[PDB]
Ligand binder design. Sequence first.
Ligand SMILES: Cc1cc2nc3c(=O)[nH]c(=O)nc-3n(C[C@H](O)[C@H](O)[C@H](O)COP(=O)(O)OP(=O)(O)OC[C@H]3O[C@@H](n4cnc5c(N)ncnc54)[C@H](O)[C@@H]3O)c2cc1C
Ligand SMILES: Cc1cc2nc3c(=O)[nH]c(=O)nc-3n(C[C@H](O)[C@H](O)[C@H](O)COP(=O)(O)OP(=O)(O)OC[C@H]3O[C@@H](n4cnc5c(N)ncnc54)[C@H](O)[C@@H]3O)c2cc1C
Lengths: 328, 328
Amino acid sequence: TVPIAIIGTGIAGLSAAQALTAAGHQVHLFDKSRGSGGRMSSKRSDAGALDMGAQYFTARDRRFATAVKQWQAQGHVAEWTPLLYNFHAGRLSPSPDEQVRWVGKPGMSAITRAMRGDMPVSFSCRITEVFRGEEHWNLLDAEGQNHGPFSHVIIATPAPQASTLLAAAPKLASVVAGVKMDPTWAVALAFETPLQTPMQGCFVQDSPLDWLARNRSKPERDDTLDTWILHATSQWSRQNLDASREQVIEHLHGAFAELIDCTMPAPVFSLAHRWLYARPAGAHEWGALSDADLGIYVCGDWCLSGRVEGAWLSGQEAARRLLEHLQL
Amino acid sequence: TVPIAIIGTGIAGLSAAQALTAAGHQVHLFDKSRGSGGRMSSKRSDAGALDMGAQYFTARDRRFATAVKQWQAQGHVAEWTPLLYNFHAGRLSPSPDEQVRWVGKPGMSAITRAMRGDMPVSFSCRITEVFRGEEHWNLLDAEGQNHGPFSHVIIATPAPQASTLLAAAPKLASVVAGVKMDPTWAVALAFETPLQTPMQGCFVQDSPLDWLARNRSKPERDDTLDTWILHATSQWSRQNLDASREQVIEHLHGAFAELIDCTMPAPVFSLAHRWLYARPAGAHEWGALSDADLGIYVCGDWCLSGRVEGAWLSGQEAARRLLEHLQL
Ligand SMILES: Cc1cc2nc3c(=O)[nH]c(=O)nc-3n(C[C@H](O)[C@H](O)[C@H](O)COP(=O)(O)OP(=O)(O)OC[C@H]3O[C@@H](n4cnc5c(N)ncnc54)[C@H](O)[C@@H]3O)c2cc1C
Ligand SMILES: Cc1cc2nc3c(=O)[nH]c(=O)nc-3n(C[C@H](O)[C@H](O)[C@H](O)COP(=O)(O)OP(=O)(O)OC[C@H]3O[C@@H](n4cnc5c(N)ncnc54)[C@H](O)[C@@H]3O)c2cc1C
């Protein structure tokens, strides 16, 4: 049988995969990484899985909220209720606690790992070319290997990366190409001695740092080492896009220490990771993009809010349009 | 000093490369392939180098012509005299004893190979990302390995492969993404026993074929085997894009036999190459695209005519602008 090709296994493509599959259709998932999860990936280091991409997420839509409800039942999601702080020259505790926040149960990557479940997925496969004959669609990866035939194709990557996958639809590529993504430099520090503060999260202004989170406070995270995640602001990340990891570990570690009143020991270890296309620069309404006649559909968080849910909804939408269009 | 980055070693890119280098600025070339030449490269076979991309080229423009006579004196280009015919009302013997044609000396490839010289180059290095810091330019390749710093970047790739390398300049991106490139299936057939026809080239109608050259008629080409290159109409290539090498070799071999009034032994060997982005669908006037303050330039045959000449011009033009901007 000729399945549907989904390029991208972050929550968007995995969302389309479920929709398509629940409606009884066959798909084949592709990703350039070793594994799935995209920007929701978790990293396993000396302190257990650290969450360095998506920090937590909310649910503002009934369907999405539903999905989350399920994942919770299955144990791949819990509620994060950290003591969040703020920064206006000094940490003051904000408490928008009326706001419910969700995280992967053992790690942010657990939601995508469960959504992937048993679907056929080709990993370490960077798709390069997407074309079609009268018949079907075909993918060419970086190794010149051909993949296909495929009935339709769903591009579920960050906009800039989607551009090269859309040469079959110039007009569509043209629009996708205008979507700007902001980068974000993330650093992770792990101390042997828990920092003496009750803080577990922090929205920061006037600092290279935009956000910080006490990773061990997240439900079910290994509590052996105190570990914090630092997220640089986009302007800083942009300005320091080419800086070395250690330099970034130097500066963001510096901004962090410069903002807590207490003492901060020598880190057992520190990691740095640059996300070139972290989140969309602006917000969008598309939901998803397409040329259904042609057979190619486009989705991702940047089609909407640039949040987990946006990404999730964008997938459902692309699937929804594919299914609808099958009435040829 | 920080070298300029040129992505792509087709004539367009080595063209910019020559002008910049001749002016004193160091450059670094990159190409995902093993060797340079792009669409002008020659394929090695048991029949010796075969020209399966650009077949021949004319020099209309005066500067491009100047460059050609210099290459000829260098021994890398020579004139070609193909007895052309036409298949429309049965194959007649229609020719332009007019338009002077040129081909690279040992093989088409000789021209870019000579232009490359000992220029610093990184082969089998596919660039996937091109981003800017506060000062410099950096590139990431498919290995997730960095390259830099670079003072400027010149993208010299077929438009669709450039859209992703233009994330830092969404405005340019959007313009390049809108450019359509037409595919072209190529096939090479070597015959142990020379075909019984006196011709050496031919234009074609009402068939999937479109052009064909007797590769041995070109200057300094191996003699032993009588190799023929056959190019398929763009129209056909599109409908048979997802075709298999075998299917393609089959049909174009069929169509080629179904048009010569002679005896055709089965080939000793046969090759098929699918040039996805063979030629720009339409002509353009741009000359080159760019955002000089950002220090990012884009060039290629598709910025002009879509012929070798335009590629070489676009190359010179892109270099002209980067050099002019060096007025601070
Ligand atoms: C540092 C950071 C912090 C964030 N914090 C939050 C937050 O706190 N709350 C929130 O709601 N959201 C947050 N986000 C955003 C959220 O992570 C994303 O909106 C969401 O994960 C997007 O999912 P996606 O499917 O659209 O894209 P992704 O999951 O990013 O992409 C899917 C896949 O596309 C693959 N791919 C790309 N190109 C190709 C190719 N050519 N061939 C094959 N595969 C390819 C990639 O490998 C990737 O795995 C954050 C993002 C980052 C980076
Ligand atoms: C089948 C065919 C027949 C043709 N016949 C003729 C003819 O008879 N006469 C004529 O005048 N013209 C002809 N042309 C056109 C001519 O070949 C082109 O106009 C010219 O070669 C374009 O050169 P370029 O430098 O602009 O691009 P190219 O030569 O196509 O490409 C340059 C390089 O970009 C590299 N590259 C691409 N993406 C990346 C990346 N992301 N990272 C690193 N490297 C990358 C590629 O590997 C390639 O080596 C023909 C073309 C084709 C394909």
